[PDB]
Amino acid sequence: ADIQTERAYQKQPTIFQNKKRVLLGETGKEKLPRYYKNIGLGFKTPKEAIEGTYIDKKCPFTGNVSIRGRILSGVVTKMKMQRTIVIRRDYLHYIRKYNRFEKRHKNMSVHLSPCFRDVQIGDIVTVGECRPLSKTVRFNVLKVTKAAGTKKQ
Amino acid sequence: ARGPKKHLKRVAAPKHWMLDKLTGVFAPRPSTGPHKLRECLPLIIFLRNRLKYALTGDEVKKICMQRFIKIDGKVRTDITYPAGFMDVISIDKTGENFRLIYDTKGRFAVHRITPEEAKYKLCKVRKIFVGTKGIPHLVTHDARTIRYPDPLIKVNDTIQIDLETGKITDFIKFDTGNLCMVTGGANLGRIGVITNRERHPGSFDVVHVKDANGNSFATRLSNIFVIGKGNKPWISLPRGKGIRLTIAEERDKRLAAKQSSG
RNA sequence: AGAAGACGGUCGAACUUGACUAUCUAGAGGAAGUAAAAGUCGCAACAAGGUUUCCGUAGGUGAACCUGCGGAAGGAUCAUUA
RNA sequence: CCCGCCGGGCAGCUUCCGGGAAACCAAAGUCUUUGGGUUCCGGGGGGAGUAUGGUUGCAAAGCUGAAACUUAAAGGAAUUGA
RNA sequence: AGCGUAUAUUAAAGUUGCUGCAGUUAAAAAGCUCGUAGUUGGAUCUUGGGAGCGGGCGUCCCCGCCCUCUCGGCGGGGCCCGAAGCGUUUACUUUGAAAAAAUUAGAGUGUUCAAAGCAGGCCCGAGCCGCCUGGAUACCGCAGCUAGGAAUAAUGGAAUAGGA
RNA sequence: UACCUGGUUGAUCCUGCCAGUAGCAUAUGCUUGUCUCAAAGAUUAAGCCAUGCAUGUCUAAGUACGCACGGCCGGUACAGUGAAACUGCGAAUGGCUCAUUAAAUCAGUUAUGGUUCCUUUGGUCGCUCGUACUUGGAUAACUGUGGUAAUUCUAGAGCUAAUACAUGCCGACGGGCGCUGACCCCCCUUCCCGGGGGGGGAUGCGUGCAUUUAUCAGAUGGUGACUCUAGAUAACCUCGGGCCGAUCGCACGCCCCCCGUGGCGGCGACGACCCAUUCGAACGUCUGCCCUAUCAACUUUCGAUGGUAGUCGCCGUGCCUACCAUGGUGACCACGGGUGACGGGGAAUCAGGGUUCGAUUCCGGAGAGGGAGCCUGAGAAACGGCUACCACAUCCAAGGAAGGCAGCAGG
RNA sequence: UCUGGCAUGUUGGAACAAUGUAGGUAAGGGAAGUCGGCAAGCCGGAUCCGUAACUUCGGGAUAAGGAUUGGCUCUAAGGGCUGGGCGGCCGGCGCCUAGCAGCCGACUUAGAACUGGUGCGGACCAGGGGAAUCCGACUGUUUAAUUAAAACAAAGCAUC
Fold it and tell me: Which chain A residues are within 8 Å of B202, Cβ to Cβ?
């Protein structure tokens, strides 16, 4: 549960966790200020993103990221990573000579913010193109949707 | 390529440029200026090819250092200066004034205007920024940045600017029911009234424009150019009111004119 | 202000070795496939081709070929009598 | 035991259903008046089920499998004689 | 003012067959079974009914019709629906927006016809101290932008109720 | 114009291919009277080049004591025609070839809110509170001397100057502000005399843009969302130093007011500190390539897949570094190889569906024998720039010098 | 080296010639010597990588080839015991539970910094290797006192 597990403690540049204190009390009673901002296209910031205590430079809400260029989606297959879920999208290419199609898929890696917790295997996740923050990952998770889930036994 | 290419070819010319194919392998490359070259016009092409005042590119240079050509009240020696949209070229020796605007055929036509009309102009803003010392400024499509604008002016508005004063005289917002002309794409060169507008958070917007003849069409925001208020433009217009007539209709008037003349 | 020059830090042309890989190439001798004018044995298949034929396996043989276990009809037999 | 009926069969036999080059076949039909789903598999005759690589086997051999070159026919069915 | 040979390639060649083949005997069904990619996967969830608007919505052929919730937004009566949504998401169909030049389809253009070229044509006692016009359109596969269509193809909703 | 015929035969129906048959590009062969257009060393040889050329340049407006000319005229003080050279700018464009390169270049769509950019244009250039009516030096051509076999070779002395280099001033404007604030004035509780509040304020530090930072308000502007463009709070502001004219021509004028020479003046050009636009520049999102399983399980101790903290990089990342659990890719064809493959816009032919060819003159990429490297420049990892190595080879007086025509002709 | 033992192996002194026996070293070549690499020399330990043909699938294999190795100063990991709300205990009142506290302990492994005239398995110990041909399959045995081999035996095969 410790936010300080890395070599150097990460700090949100905008916020000022360090504040003076008054007599008969302390600023530690109240939680630290959290900097976040919602996005357009109806991308309302989910509950865990506001009230979470996590700190991430690369999160869609508490970071520098601006989502632009193209808005896409995909499914969830594997989750063995550090804050990355591998997704794959089906698309049918048309061949003129034989007047038919071929099933095709080009899977990519998306970096997921730690605020989203409820993701299982076989559900859709909506992602959007962003800056080349990594060498391979150029997308960020913006929405989580289930697919015949909400009941696991 | 190792940097900025310094030549244009005969085929590299824009299509709406009326340049011949068998005269030369190069073209008069428009040099840098207040307009993107892909939608501008050099002085040589304006005079030699259109007005037929000069027959060779050398002769166009001859009159330029004779300093008989003026643009926006300023004498420019650049033969390849980018005379872009809303540029007025006035020749005092012949006492003629031309307003450079698009015609019904999406072409950079030459339209004669009165000197009094040439004294003022019309420009479109692009962005608003609070520059030095906390005051606003406007950057336009003409790259004529203006200090201390009217605060009521917003993005995509049209500001009247005089040649000598170079200031804001009359501004008009962007709204429905206002006359506008398309500045790109397939509908380039059409005049109509904005009937509708739809927005998209993350892509371009679409403004539906319906002209006087009922030929409705749709256009992108970046190709909208506001000229006048309501149904009356602030400036004169060329033949056809900027209305694109069909292939069959145009040939009908063409044959009628031929028969009447003959 | 500073030329010549020396130490440490990086690709590194090039070099040596080794490994892997691709292509092109010589080679004594050996053994096949291609055409033949039509040279020597008797004749396996075409008839019930006289030991129906073909299939696989095994085995043998101057050669076609022979033999056994099965397996078919391209063997002469939609049939063989209460 | 006899008479039938119903569903699943191995089946003849006749038949201008039909298709097929015909021999023959209710599938070897609904096929140019061309589309119910799909696998394996062929692309003139040889070279050749050969060479080489891989893999299985104690061996014999099995599975996978070319190229160079060469030929105007090889073939299927049917017609009358011998 | 041409023709042949040589070789590469297309149609021929339904002789690679998606369109559009064949497998008893002409080349060919694996001995058979299982099984995963992958392929193809039955009907079934608003269809009619008098709408009136037009002809020969009457039967029949081309049009919207008797989708929400918030200031009924040009401190509170009908002459209003601009925007914060979607009684869900794809595929396809049509339009619209996105289309660097040439070529090609082709508009008009003559005068040596055309291939070509985007030019030229138009009254002239010539003071005629020269008027007008063309230099358009179509297509741009697939991928993505947008507004409708909501047959066809698959998907879920709520069954131990963790249901609106 | 959605087509056959001949060819297995004693002759016929089939299967099946070829022979003829029609266009298409390279050359060969025989002939060839005219004109209008027009392709033309890519194929094996991206192999090597003798020779000649292909990048130079000046306005009234940077610099002009060249015995190369020349007007006024030797009382003046800066004439001009102008070699050459310094200074700034172009040479990274153009043009030839496809060696190399196979999700790579490129073709369609998008972003750089993830960055920069002499060039033209639009702003700004009294915004900051601290010798000027013009500053120091050498270096050019030039003269006079020299070296060898030498170049687009050159040291040492006397000169001269720049819009070249370095330093740098007064003006420009009287003041405000935040702190530190002595001192001075006024008001109220207080029967007392202490406090509670308003103001001036000398004297001190700072008080513009560019940049680095840490903090605050943000129902100034706008986007859908930037940590944005703005305002302040406290510092640095690089001596391998940012900005505030030591620049050059044109026609020449107004004022002596408190003055016989002081101020006021226009038209421009020259590069800037920063912002914008344009030519652009490079790294990016979705979508698309030829043959190949006799290439099936591959990348990863050496960075491969991601996170955290650093480094540079014009900026955003395994570009690099260290610690972290293994991850990613693959029968929807990876990894590998071949290609007589640069890609595409595009070309031949035609019922339709289609099959082939794409260097070519168009738009992008790569190369200049090979791959290495680099200084100036905004933009080079540049070859009509240099260096080193490898083959080739030019001159040599044997001590060295000097090289790349897949640029245009020609061999 | 210690406990224990000894007096250099049936004599001593002096010198340091040739030839010899035993032990070393050698510039530049690198088997040119010789019947023949005989003799000598090279390699040698351990750790981390990497290993071919062929094959009876067991091997070949320490194949071949490469890197490291000292000293010093640190770091990380690898365990044992006891306890769990003056002296006891009749008791609800306690809850060891991401295994916490205290005490005890030996041997290694890995990583890093520093450091020396790049020297470090520093002496000692301690495989040169590869491509082939012939014979015998292999292990074993044999002419004590010149022949250790291809000879003999051997399992297996066959015969009487």
Answer: 40-41, 68, 71
